[PDB]
Amino acid sequence: YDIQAWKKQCEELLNLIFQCEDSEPFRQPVDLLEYPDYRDIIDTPMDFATVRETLEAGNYESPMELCKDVRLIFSNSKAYTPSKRSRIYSMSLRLSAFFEEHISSVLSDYKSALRFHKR
Numbered sequence: 085y086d087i088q089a090w091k092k093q094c095e096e097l098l099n100l101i102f103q104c105e106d107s108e109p110f111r112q113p114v115d116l117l118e119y120p121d122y123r124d125i126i127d128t129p130m131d132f133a134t135v136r137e138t139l140e141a142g143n144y145e146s147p148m149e150l151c152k153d154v155r156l157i158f159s160n161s162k163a164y165t166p167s168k169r170s171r172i173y174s175m176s177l178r179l180s181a182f183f184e185e186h187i188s189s190v191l192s193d194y195k196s197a198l199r200f201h202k203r
């Protein structure tokens with residue numbers, strides 16, 4: 085019932101994501117010189133270094149807020165892809181399945197900890 089445990093769990097999951105070859109297109113903001121029309125389609129850019137920095141600055145209040153920003157990395161890739169069979173989009177799908185499989189217990193444990201505290 086540790087209410088704060090999600091933070092280190094999320095740091096460790098981000099470490100696994102940064103080791104994954106599938107995360108390379110998403111580690112830093114999308115290069116606007118390489119994709120000149122990117123901001124014509126994407127309203128809110130997001131990347132894993134921004135998620136890690138926000139976590140490390142103490143600017144997430146819960147793992148749900150972190151999960152919303154990671155999900156935005158994946159929804160931006162899906163909105164920007166010219167094809168659902170593109171290389172970078174295909175990497176985003178695999179990485180999203182890996183993230184979702186690992187974040188489930190972090191969210192469950194955090195919510196259980198809040199419920200125990202409320203009692």
Ligand SMILES: Cn1nnc2c1C[C@@H](C(=O)O)CC2
Binds near residue numbers: 162
């Ligand atoms: C920068 N980026 N993020 N997601 C994607 C891309 C490139 C896009 C394309 O290949 O034109 C496919 C999906």
